[PDB]
């Protein structure tokens, strides 16, 4: 329902998916040769099947391939500061793969929007969707677009002719919440005849 979802969300408005009261098998996730790279930071990508969790927060957004490294702790950038942030103690995995076959148009796919101008970096797991005009000068423009006022939102052009280093990609990030409650998200335990 998440990776094969019908609709996608913008990076500046990254949707949050809540996972609870279900059994998830990650063998198909990391055993598939159709996923570009699944960046796993915090515990393990493989020997984690002996660890349970209460709730899992799932987020997904479309970014360019040049920004793959930006989705990580201790990173700075457009998305890494003004749109998303990961703490240095983050637990979870990040997955990205090619999206040219689904999110590219000859005339350019401009449906995806991202924040470009911001006064300060965001907190971890903090989503900013404000459309307030950014003032880059000392003299205020009284909320009027002009020399000292620029739109904080920006879009990227996706075309089939774009190179492998410039094709669009879809990035999915997963995080785990471990409160003082019994676990609700479990993995398939070993079964034998």
């Amino acid at each position: 329902e998440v990776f094969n979802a019908t609709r996608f969300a913008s990076v500046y408005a990254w949707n949050r998916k809540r996972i609870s009261n279900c059994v998830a098998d990650y063998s198909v996730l990391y055993n598939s040769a159709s996923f570009s790279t699944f960046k796993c930071y915090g515990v393990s990508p493989t020997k984690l099947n002996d660890l349970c969790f209460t709730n899992v927060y799932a987020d997904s957004f479309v970014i360019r391939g040049d920004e793959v490294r930006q989705i990580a702790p201790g990173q700075t950038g457009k998305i890494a500061d003004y749109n998303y942030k990961l703490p240095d103690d983050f637990t979870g995995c990040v997955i990205a793969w090619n999206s040219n076959n689904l999110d590219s148009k000859v005339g350019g796919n401009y449906n995806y929007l991202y924040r470009l101008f911001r006064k300060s970096n965001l907190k971890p797991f903090e989503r900013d969707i404000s459309t307030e005009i950014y003032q880059a000068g000392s003299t205020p423009c009284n909320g009027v677009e002009g020399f000292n006022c620029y739109f904080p939102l920006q879009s990227y052009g996706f075309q089939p002719t774009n190179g492998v280093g410039y094709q669009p990609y879809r990035v999915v990030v997963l995080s785990f919440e471990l409160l003082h409650a019994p676990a609700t998200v479990c993995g398939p335990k070993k079964s034998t005849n």
Partner: antibody
Amino acid sequence: QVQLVESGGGVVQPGRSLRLSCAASGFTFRSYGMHWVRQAPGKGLEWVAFISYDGSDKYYADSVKGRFTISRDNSKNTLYLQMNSLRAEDTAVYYCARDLSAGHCTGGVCYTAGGIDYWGQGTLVTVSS
Amino acid sequence: NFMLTQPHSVSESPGKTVTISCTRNSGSIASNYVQWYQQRPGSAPTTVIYEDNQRPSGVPDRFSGSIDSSSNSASLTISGLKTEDEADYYCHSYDSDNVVFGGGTKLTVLG
């Protein structure tokens, strides 16, 4: 900012035993897989070994297979390398490193790889006549 | 175990692009882990490219890696070099037993 500090190398007599360490600062050390790599003057990079984030999985080199010892301790936020049996070639600064990815995969092959973007200050072993 | 070969010295003016034949003569290096590091002499090496075409922070965008799928090799492309780029380039990776380093390079900027 995240940074690593290594110290302990210097004047050491051949054939003896020694202990080295990697100080860490900035990130959750226990959430990462540590490194051990040496760089000889007049030569290039000479990787030594690797270690899983929790110490269960360890990976080593063929040239000094069994000749050193590699270890880490989570609580003290430190990384260690109980190297032994120094020879002529091993004159090399030792660089402790952070992993760019923990255990990433192509899709079919899943191992704890090694990727370095942030390095340490450097400690150099001096074994000479 | 394995061995990569690098031209120990290549000369090229900064206006054009240089390439390196990261040739590991044994086995195969397809669908495995990829690394690349650059060293200013007398200092610690600096990473260039990891896993095909991924570049670190602060490095000029001019660098760009590549892999020859048919010939079982790799290559690095840097467009519009600079005299500041005079350094040592190394080819590291990991086959799933150990890590191998290449012969090294001495790139010369003919400016």
